[PDB]
Amino acid sequence: ASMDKVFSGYYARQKLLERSDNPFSKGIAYVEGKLVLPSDARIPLLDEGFMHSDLTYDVISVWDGRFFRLDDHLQRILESCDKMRLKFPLALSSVKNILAEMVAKSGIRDAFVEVIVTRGLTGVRGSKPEDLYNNNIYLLVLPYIWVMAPENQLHGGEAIITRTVRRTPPGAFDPTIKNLQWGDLTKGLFEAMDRGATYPFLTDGDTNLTEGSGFNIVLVKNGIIYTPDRGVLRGITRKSVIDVARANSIDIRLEVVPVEQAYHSDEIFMCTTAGGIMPITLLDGQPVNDGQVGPITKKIWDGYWEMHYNPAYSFPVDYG
């Protein structure tokens, strides 16, 4: 649907949420079998998710009371756990039920839902593999988080190609495993600050684009969509962009994307669960094309938000 329809609905739902006297309207967490306010939630100091960031995670959205692509996200964090040699510690059916219960209890209709699986209390260094499967899980539901605020999506945002940092390469850490080892991405955020921009686009140092601080990067040139095929998370928002492109008969190329190409793009946008489809209209301080949000970006934008109401991709939470 259109930006104005999507956002006006969000604003109405928010304003209602903000008037709520339910303390869980600010979020809810599940830690050691108990529901607690996120500010009160605590984890063991000795959890290896803290002591060596030895964890994977995933993030799902709820929009207008509808979970979006929950099955796809759960499959992804099962794959991440397998790649990490972590045993996912709950039945999938159990996690699905608990997450829906959390969202319902909060009353939050537009939510950010985070699932974290850590190595647990026994570190890898000095352990037998069979002693490394008592793994911990933490669940968190918050009001929907925007990597680009609604008001900013109308006009687009300001990016830089980073020059003080490059993406951690796959031979150091497999970027298809969604992880919280953000040392490169965090530095990119600071570089953007220092350079008067907001969004860092990290290279691989070998002249190609990868991803940013919590989003994939998409270029549009001569009617074709391009996005990096390696060095990045296989985003489910990106997956959804591919679906919308198919529905619209727009060619999309998953391939190596040289940095040079960003400087001649007709359109650029970022994509992620925490915000959706986020246009970029300034790059390294200069306009991207004419400086306007472009027509293919808008088609993708509208189709992406329509998927949030499509029963093939979403289901409603029962708030009771």
Ligand X SMILES: *Cc1c(COP(=O)(O)O)cnc(C)c1O
Measured in whole angstroms, the distance separating CA 161 from the mean position of its chain's CA atoms is 20
93 burial type by CB count under 10 A (0-12 exposed, 13-18 middle, 19+ buried): exposed
Binding of residue 156 to ligand X (CB under 6 A): no
Taking the least distance from each CB to ligand X, the nearer of 214 and 279 is 214
**Out of 106, 237, 281, 314, the residue judged to bind ligand X by CB under 6 A:** 237
Query: Is 272 part of any known ligand binding site?
Result: no
Tell me the residue ranges of DSSP E strands in 98-206.
111-118, 136-143, 157-161, 199-203
Query: Is 237 part of any known ligand binding site?
Result: yes
**38 contact, one of ligand X, Cl ion, a second copy, none, CB 5-8 Å limit per kind:** a second copy
Taking the least distance from each CB to Cl ion, the nearer of 117 and 288 is 117
* Sole window of 12-20, 63-71, 125-133, 307-315 interacting with a second copy (rule: CB under 8 A): 125-133
Q: Shortest approach of K ion to residue 52 CB, angstroms? A: 16
Sign of CA dihedral 182, 184, 185, 188: positive
Taking the least distance from each CB to K ion, the nearer of 81 and 197 is 81
- Residue 281 structure tokens: 């209209």
Query: Is 236 part of any known ligand binding site?
Result: yes
Please, which residues have CB within 8 angstroms of residue 101's CB and are 6 or more apart in sequence?
none
Closest CA to 59 of 223, 273, 219, 261: 273
Binding of residue 32 to a second copy (CB under 8 A): no
**56 contact, one of ligand X, K ion, a second copy, none, CB 5-8 Å limit per kind:** K ion
Query: CA triplet 300, 306, 310: central angle to 5 degrees?
Result: 130
- Please give the residue ranges that form the binding site for Cl ion (CB under 5 A): 56-58, 73-74, 77, 115, 117
**221 contact, one of ligand X, K ion, Cl ion, none, CB 5-8 Å limit per kind:** none
Contacts of a second copy in 78-97 (CB under 8 A): 85
Angle at which helix 236-247 crosses helix 70-84, to 10 degrees, equals 130
d(CA 209, CA 314): 31
Contacts of a second copy in 132-171 (CB under 8 A): 138, 140, 147, 165-169, 171
Closest CA to 190 of 204, 178, 175, 202: 202
Residue 60 near residue 70 (C-beta atoms within 8 A): yes
Q: Shortest approach of ligand X to residue 69 CB, angstroms? A: 9
Q: Shortest approach of a second copy to residue 212 CB, angstroms? A: 10
3-class DSSP state of 260: helix
Binding of residue 42 to a second copy (CB under 8 A): yes
List contacts with ligand X (CB under 6 A): 59, 178, 211, 214-216, 233, 235-238, 271-273
